[PDB]
Amino acid sequence: MEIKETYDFSSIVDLWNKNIGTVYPMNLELFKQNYINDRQRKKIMGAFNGEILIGFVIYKQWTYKSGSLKPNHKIGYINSIIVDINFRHQGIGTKLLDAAEEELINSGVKILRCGSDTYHFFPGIPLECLPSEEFFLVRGYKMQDYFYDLIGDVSKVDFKKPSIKDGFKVNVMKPEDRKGLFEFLEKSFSGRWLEEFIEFFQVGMKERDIVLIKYKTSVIGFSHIYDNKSSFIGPPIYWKALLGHNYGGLGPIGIDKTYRKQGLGRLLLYESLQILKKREVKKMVIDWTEKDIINFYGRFNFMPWKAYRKATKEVK
Amino acid sequence: MEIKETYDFSSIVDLWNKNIGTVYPMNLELFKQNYINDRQRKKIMGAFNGEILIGFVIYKQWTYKSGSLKPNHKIGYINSIIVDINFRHQGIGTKLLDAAEEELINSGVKILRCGSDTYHFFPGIPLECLPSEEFFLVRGYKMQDYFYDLIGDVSKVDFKKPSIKDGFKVNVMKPEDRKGLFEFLEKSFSGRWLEEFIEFFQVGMKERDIVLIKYKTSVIGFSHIYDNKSSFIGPPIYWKALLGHNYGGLGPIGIDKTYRKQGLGRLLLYESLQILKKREVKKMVIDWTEKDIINFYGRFNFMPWKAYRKATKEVK
Numbered sequence: 001m002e003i004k005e006t007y008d009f010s011s012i013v014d015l016w017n018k019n020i021g022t023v024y025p026m027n028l029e030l031f032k033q034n035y036i037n038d039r040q041r042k043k044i045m046g047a048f049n050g051e052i053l054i055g056f057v058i059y060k061q062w063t064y065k066s067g068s069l070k071p072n073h074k075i076g077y078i079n080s081i082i083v084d085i086n087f088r089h090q091g092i093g094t095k096l097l098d099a100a101e102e103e104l105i106n107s108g109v110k111i112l113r114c115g116s117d118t119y120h121f122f123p124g125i126p127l128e129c130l131p132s133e134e135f136f137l138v139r140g141y142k143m144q145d146y147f148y149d150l151i152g153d154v155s156k157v158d159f160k161k162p163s164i165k166d167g168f169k170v171n172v173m174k175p176e177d178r179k180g181l182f183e184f185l186e187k188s189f190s191g192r193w194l195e196e197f198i199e200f201f202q203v204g205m206k207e208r209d210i211v212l213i214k215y216k217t218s219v220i221g222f223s224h225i226y227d228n229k230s231s232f233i234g235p236p237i238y239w240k241a242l243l244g245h246n247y248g249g250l251g252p253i254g255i256d257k258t259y260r261k262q263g264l265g266r267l268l269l270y271e272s273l274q275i276l277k278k279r280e281v282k283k284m285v286i287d288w289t290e291k292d293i294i295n296f297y298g299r300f301n302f303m304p305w306k307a308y309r310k311a312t313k314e315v316k
Numbered sequence: 317m318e319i320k321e322t323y324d325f326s327s328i329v330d331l332w333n334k335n336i337g338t339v340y341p342m343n344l345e346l347f348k349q350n351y352i353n354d355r356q357r358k359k360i361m362g363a364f365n366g367e368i369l370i371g372f373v374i375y376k377q378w379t380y381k382s383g384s385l386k387p388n389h390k391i392g393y394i395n396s397i398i399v400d401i402n403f404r405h406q407g408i409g410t411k412l413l414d415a416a417e418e419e420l421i422n423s424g425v426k427i428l429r430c431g432s433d434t435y436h437f438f439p440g441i442p443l444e445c446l447p448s449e450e451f452f453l454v455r456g457y458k459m460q461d462y463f464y465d466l467i468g469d470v471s472k473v474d475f476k477k478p479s480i481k482d483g484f485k486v487n488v489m490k491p492e493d494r495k496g497l498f499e500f501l502e503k504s505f506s507g508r509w510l511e512e513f514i515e516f517f518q519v520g521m522k523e524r525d526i527v528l529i530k531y532k533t534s535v536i537g538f539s540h541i542y543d544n545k546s547s548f549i550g551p552p553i554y555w556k557a558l559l560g561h562n563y564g565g566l567g568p569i570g571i572d573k574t575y576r577k578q579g580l581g582r583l584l585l586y587e588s589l590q591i592l593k594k595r596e597v598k599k600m601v602i603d604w605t606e607k608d609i610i611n612f613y614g615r616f617n618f619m620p621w622k623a624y625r626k627a628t629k630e631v632k
């Protein structure tokens with residue numbers, strides 16, 4: 001049995017599907033999009049029985065800027081780790097993670113995160129992988145709080161437009177909005193979301209995927225919406241195989257800090273959902289939310305669908 | 317807004333589906349099956365806007381025997397409670413649950429359970445219903461452990477036969493096994509499972525739905541299995557609309573206490589899954605399991621799919 005770097009994305013996608021595909025159906029298009037476009041120091045280490053892949057770990061160190069933020073090289077990530085069901089409890093997971101962790105630690109990592117990377121597949125350890133929590137505990141990861149993906153069927157319900165002060169207006173992004181959008185993100189969301197707007201617009205995100213809220217001529221918030229015409233496959237639609245026809249998704253969404261708590265996020269969400277509804281979307285996801293924000297989406301009939309546990313190892 | 321008793325099952329199912337149907341798709345066949353056949357003192361209270369149903373609660377008191385156990389009238393159950401999404405935060409849920417709890421308390425109930433009733437829909441508060449935990453907490457319910465439905469696709473993996481063992485055979489039940497099964501249940505599982513075997517056989521459970529493990533001549537364990545030909549719709553296949561064409565399920569499963577921890581459960585599971593696999597089952601569920609047994613099913617590639625929180629209120 002040998003541990004070595006692996007390049008065959010198709011073998012990895014198949015092992016993924018065979019083992020967890022019922023709840024996290026992967027495809028090669030998604031896998032390639034997220035692995036290839038990632039800008040971090042990244043690697044896939046495989047475990048092999050002769051020519052046969054029997055396990056893999058995908059892992060990263062934070063080495064590329066996030067908008068205006070410098071990378072923090074002390075942070076590394078376990079994107080994913082799967083050992084094939086016929087080869088469990090032989091120490092292969094341990095070997096794979098020993099290798100990955102040792103590499104990361106030797107390049108200066110002090111904090112190891114389960115998921116939550118750029119171009120992640122998971123915000124944390126999925127509930128469907130709850131038995132792995134013990135695997136991670138044995139290695140010194142600490143189990144923290146939860147994040148959720150929410151689901152709802154926007155075709156089944158109608159809501160009254162929430163009330164708002166005069167002077168605000170929501171519309172799908174137009175090409176001439178790009179400069180205003182970027183100025184707004186540099187001001188209000190100048191880390192990860194800024195970085196993602198920069199990068200995602202280079203690999204197929206289109207203006208039709210973005211909804212903007214303005215106060216008069218100024219951009220004061222946005223959402224990213226998804227349907228089956230989106231070219232860029234973002235987190236709300238990763239698991240689109242589970243969502244049926246006319247799937248969609250919404251996330252992230254953000255309102256300038258000075259404008260928060262006046263009902264403008266509710267208005268943006270409402271109008272974004274109306275857009276999707278008129279696009280004939282049915283089941284759709286809201287990705288990677290926190291418990292205290294579920295009810296914001298809940299009032300629009302979204303419910304928790306998937307849960308992920310944050311988990312962190314501090315290097316001694 | 318009037319609160320009164322209802323038996324409009326179609327309206328309840330429609331309101332169920334509109335509100336939570338993306339994750340708990342209900343059909344009228346199941347709803348009628350479970351409600352009409354339950355033998356407890358039971359009731360549905362509806363909330364109405366004129367003639368339009370806008371919420372309901374289904375509740376029960378333990379008044380009917382459970383196998384060898386006489387009933388304990390001190391236990392009551394909230395089967396389900398849903399208020400329509402366009403009528404939330406107006407006091408309707410409070411009024412419905414007040415009406416249920418008052419009636420039950422007036423009939424001697426001291427312990428109120430969320431779910432877990434006979435002919436339940438839910439073993440506890442679903443994770444997709446996590447926001448309702450706040451509503452129940454305020455109302456005196458304590459949040460306790462989780463239970464899980466597991467999911468797996470038995471078409472996707474080949475398993476090795478477990479260590480072959482002298483004396484033991486596993487086969488689908490034949491009609492002449494009836495007496496042997498009942499005597500076994502009377503000995504080893506003489507409460508709820510005995511009760512369900514008796515009752516389910518009267519509403520369309522068939523011998524082909526039962527697998528037995530015998531040591532020589534003696535029944536020492538059983539499983540209840542499900543596919544798309546089962547006429548009795550039991551918990552594993554409640555949510556079959558999520559499970560695709562060739563759906564199935566397995567639960568309950570049990571081995572006589574005397575014979576535990578020697579691999580006979582494993583053997584019974586393996587052979588039950590082989591029978592399903594041969595019946596062309598793909599996606600299938602293992603229902604209402606405790607955390608510490610997940611790994612037993614996990615060996616066969618099952619993963620936690622749905623979580624339910626046990627929750628109990630003690631009347632002061």
Ligand SMILES: CC(=O)SCCNC(=O)CCNC(=O)[C@H](O)C(C)(C)COP(=O)(O)OP(=O)(O)OC[C@H]1O[C@@H](n2cnc3c(N)ncnc32)[C@H](O)[C@@H]1OP(=O)(O)O
Pocket residue numbers: 019020078079080081082083084087088089090091092093094095114115122124125126128129130131132134135138611614
């Ligand atoms: C960021 C993320 O990737 S989250 C997703 C994690 N991945 C998954 O859940 C995918 C499905 N599961 C798997 O692929 C595997 O079970 C893995 C990767 C979690 C573990 O791989 P294995 O090769 O079986 O691990 P290994 O044999 O090294 O196990 C080492 C020890 O960790 C612990 N451990 C491993 N699996 C389990 C489990 N299911 N329950 C409890 N403890 C466990 C045990 O202490 C085990 O020692 P033991 O075998 O003496 O009990």
Ligand SMILES: CC(=O)SCCNC(=O)CCNC(=O)[C@H](O)C(C)(C)COP(=O)(O)OP(=O)(O)OC[C@H]1O[C@@H](n2cnc3c(N)ncnc32)[C@H](O)[C@@H]1OP(=O)(O)O
Pocket residue numbers: 335336394395396397398399400403404405406407408409410411430431438440441442444445446447448450451454
């Ligand atoms: C065993 C099981 O059934 S588990 C599944 C439980 N069901 C679900 O999760 C389904 C989805 N959710 C729902 O159907 C609902 O949210 C329910 C049933 C949980 C609650 O029903 P509602 O009708 O919204 O409840 P209700 O309005 O009485 O109370 C909610 C809150 O609004 C408050 N409220 C009451 N009137 C008003 C009002 N006029 N304005 C604003 N708030 C109000 C209540 O005081 C309560 O606050 P509190 O909990 O701090 O006391």
Ligand SMILES: N[C@@H]1[C@@H](O)[C@H](O[C@@H]2O[C@H](CO)[C@@H](O)[C@H](O)[C@H]2N)[C@@H](CO)O[C@@H]1O
Pocket residue numbers: 192193196235236250251252253287288289290
């Ligand atoms: N840094 C975390 C954010 O990343 C989280 O927000 C989530 O971010 C992802 C990745 O950009 C988006 O796709 C999601 O829509 C978004 N909710 C946030 C979650 O509360 O936690 C951190 O801030």
Ligand SMILES: N[C@@H]1[C@@H](O)[C@H](O[C@@H]2O[C@H](CO)[C@@H](O)[C@H](O)[C@H]2N)[C@@H](CO)O[C@@H]1O
Pocket residue numbers: 508509512551552566567568569603604605606
């Ligand atoms: N009394 C509880 C049992 O009922 C639970 O077992 C579960 O029971 C249901 C209904 O009989 C079956 O459909 C499930 O297959 C079975 N696992 C048990 C779960 O640990 O908790 C109690 O014992």
